[PDB]
Amino acid sequence: HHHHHHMVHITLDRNTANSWLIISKDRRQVRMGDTHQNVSDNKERFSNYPMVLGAQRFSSGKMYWEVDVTQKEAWDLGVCRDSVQRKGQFSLSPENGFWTIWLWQDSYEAGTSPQTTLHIQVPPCQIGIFVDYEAGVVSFYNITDHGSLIYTFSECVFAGPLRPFFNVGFNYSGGNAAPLKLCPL
Numbered sequence: 001h002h003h004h005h006h007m008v009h010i011t012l013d014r015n016t017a018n019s020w021l022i023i024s025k026d027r028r029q030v031r032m033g034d035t036h037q038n039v040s041d042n043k044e045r046f047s048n049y050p051m052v053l054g055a056q057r058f059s060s061g062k063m064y065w066e067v068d069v070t071q072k073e074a075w076d077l078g079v080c081r082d083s084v085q086r087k088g089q090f091s092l093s094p095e096n097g098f099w100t101i102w103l104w105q106d107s108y109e110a111g112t113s114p115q116t117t118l119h120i121q122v123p124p125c126q127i128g129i130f131v132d133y134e135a136g137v138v139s140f141y142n143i144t145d146h147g148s149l150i151y152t153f154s155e156c157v158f159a160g161p162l163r164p165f166f167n168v169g170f171n172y173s174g175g176n177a178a179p180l181k182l183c184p185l
């Protein structure tokens with residue numbers, strides 16, 4: 001992929017974070033805290049899952065960013081509609097306004113309904129996310145393996161502005177405390 005040149009500087013939006021998340025001062029890293037982080041509730045916060053949005057909103061063009069997933073056991077990454085549900089239970093699917101991939105229980109899967117098995121030969125430590133708004137495309141790249149393709153969603157129904165989407169996963173095991181980190185350009 002020659003997508004690096006559409007690189008965008010993503011930062012995380014505190015106000016959208018689940019109340020247990022800790023976002024770094026530079027708004028480039030997020031991790032699960034061991035408790036509620038002493039913030040007020042608001043209608044933007046994801047209530048049920050350890051999720052947060054990027055601050056940036058995209059309605060046109062080509063955008064690319066990279067995320068470090070080193071030493072995590074569970075996560076989900078991609079993009080979503082600005083209008084996604086925040087409260088209660090829901091599945092990560094294009095029908096619900098999410099275009100994502102995840103790691104769960106030693107398997108990589110695309111967030112389709114039902115989910116799709118991914119075939120990755122080299123477990124990734126950094127993931128590249130590429131959005132082509134006009135083309136209706138969201139693609140995922142394995143930065144650890146020379147930028148090899150992981151998955152492409154096509155014919156996407158964005159149906160409004162898009163936001164970068166992050167889920168650090170729960171830490172029931174004690175093995176998933178590590179952060180998600182936005183990588184430098």
Ligand SMILES: c1cnc(N2CC[C@]3(CCOC3)C2)cn1
Nearest residue numbers: 074075076102103104167169170
């Ligand atoms: C079915 C449905 N959803 C699944 N996941 C949602 C995202 C995780 C990774 C982070 O925590 C949860 C996996 C897995 N199987």
